[PDB]
Amino acid sequence: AFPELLDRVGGRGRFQLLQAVALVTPILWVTTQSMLENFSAAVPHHRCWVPLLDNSGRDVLLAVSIPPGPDQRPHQCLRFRQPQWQLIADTEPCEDGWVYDHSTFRSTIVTTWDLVCDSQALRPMAQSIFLAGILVGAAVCGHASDRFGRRRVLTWSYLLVSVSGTIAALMPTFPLYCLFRFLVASAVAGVMMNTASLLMEWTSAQAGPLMMTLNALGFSFGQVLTGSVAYGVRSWRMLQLAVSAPFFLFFVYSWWLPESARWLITVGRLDQSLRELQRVAAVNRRKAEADTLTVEVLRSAMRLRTFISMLCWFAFGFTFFGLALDLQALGSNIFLLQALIGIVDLPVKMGSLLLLSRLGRRLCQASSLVLPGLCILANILVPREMGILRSSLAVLGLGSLGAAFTCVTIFSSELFPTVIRMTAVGLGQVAARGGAMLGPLVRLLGVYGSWLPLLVYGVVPVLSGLAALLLP
Numbered sequence: 001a002f003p004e005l006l007d008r009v010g011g012r013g014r015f016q017l018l019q020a021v022a023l024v025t026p027i028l029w030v031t032t033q034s035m036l037e038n039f040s041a042a043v044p045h046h047r048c049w050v051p052l053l054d055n056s057g058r059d060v061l062l063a064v065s066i067p068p069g070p071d072q073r074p075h076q077c078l079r080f081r082q083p084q085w086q087l088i089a090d091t092e093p094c095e096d097g098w099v100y101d102h103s104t105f106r107s108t109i110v111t112t113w114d115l116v117c118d119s120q121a122l123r124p125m126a127q128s129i130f131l132a133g134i135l136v137g138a139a140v141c142g143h144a145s146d147r148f149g150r151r152r153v154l155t156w157s158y159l160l161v162s163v164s165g166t167i168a169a170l171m172p173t174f175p176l177y178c179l180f181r182f183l184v185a186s187a188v189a190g191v192m193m194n195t196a197s198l199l200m201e202w203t204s205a206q207a208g209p210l211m212m213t214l215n216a217l218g219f220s221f222g223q224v225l226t227g228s229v230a231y232g233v234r235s236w237r238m239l240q241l242a243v244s245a246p247f248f249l250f251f252v253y254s255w256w257l258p259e260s261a262r263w264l265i266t267v268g269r270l271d272q273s274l275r276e277l278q279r280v281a282a283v284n285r286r287k288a289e290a291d292t293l294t295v296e297v298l299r300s301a302m303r304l305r306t307f308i309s310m311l312c313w314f315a316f317g318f319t320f321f322g323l324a325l326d327l328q329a330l331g332s333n334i335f336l337l338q339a340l341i342g343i344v345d346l347p348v349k350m351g352s353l354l355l356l357s358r359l360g361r362r363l364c365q366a367s368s369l370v371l372p373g374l375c376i377l378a379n380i381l382v383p384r385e386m387g388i389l390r391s392s393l394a395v396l397g398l399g400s401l402g403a404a405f406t407c408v409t410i411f412s413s414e415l416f417p418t419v420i421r422m423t424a425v426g427l428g429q430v431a432a433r434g435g436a437m438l439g440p441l442v443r444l445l446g447v448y449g450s451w452l453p454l455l456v457y458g459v460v461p462v463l464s465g466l467a468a469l470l471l472p
């Protein structure tokens, strides 16, 4: 009988907007902390240190010192034992360290800890660890908001994000950095889930719309915030601190947001629920029907389609999170990318939804997965000669794939006895977080041809979309 009480106290109004703003604003920095492993763990051009150069015709010295590499470049992992002056066989690996190109980035973790050459596999493992941390933190938090509340967990998760992010920027050794990024990921997942649930609960029956949409926009924009912040600060120690600093103020000001009143009723804290509802009514200025609340009212108040949905969620998560953390391979001028994936995301998603809803729900679901997979696959076919076409296809593909989590959540998830969709969205999204940890691990196939990762990332979504047509 809670919706009757909610209609009695308010609905829409003023408080539901202020709370919405204050709970959606964290989402931008939550995205910023998640896409940060693209300007922090960036790989600049590296050479082998040689005594003849870099102190104790520069082009001639570079030619004699290092053997040439295959890709029209000097070798990045080998060095001549002695200066081969015969150039107007016997090679040894780098042992005095490397030298890097300090022209776009001042200091990355790759530069700091030498995650190049033989120890190349370490880099595509930090992102996998981070995503596994998100999955684990989201799994634990579910049975954590039923014994501690729903607003306290949000504030404590804010504090954990801030402290762990600040501490992770001062570590001198790689495993400590990985562990603290794991903790950051878990706390971020907790923040995500608790914010979503809090936005759902306090809103009236029209929460399915706006509210849930207002979340996504958060990400989209956030993307651009990540891009701008990255363009701002170049060093990697001063990027993590600058990103994790706001969360302390977020935790400080999150001490006044009212806690969800529906949860308080089921546990037995009637007085707190009364105070909460009265203060919400006072904020909403609907202090006319509140006198009816005299405790007693609240005292009396107290299979194939599923598999298709799981496959679609898995394909979307796997492709997006195994391809959008390596944007240095999709083009150039990285700061312009990762800042064009929201400005393309919004118009494309709205236009595609509006245009394809009328044709049919299954048609829209199918067309949202074949198109971006084919777009990504077509990136290989084009050569390097046209860079604009080389980069626009990837942006269009990512923007179109971003519409999947919107189309398959609000328009889909009704493919069931139609009792409540909250038991289906989470079930589908579990495979989305469980398919991203199996993501960047594909990029470990750089050896044995470089086209295989892109080929897999292009064939998986198209196969999932083609299988989606087999509903009957």
Ligand SMILES: O=C1C(CCS(=O)c2ccccc2)C(=O)N(c2ccccc2)N1c1ccccc1
Pocket: 134, 192, 193, 196, 197, 215, 216, 219, 317, 321, 405, 425, 426, 432, 433, 436
């Ligand atoms: O927007 C989200 C959240 C939603 C959880 S949520 O709102 C909730 C609702 C109801 C009950 C409990 C919790 C999320 O976890 N991912 C995600 C994380 C890791 C891997 C894959 C997906 N994305 C997402 C979607 C598209 C593009 C990027 C990110």
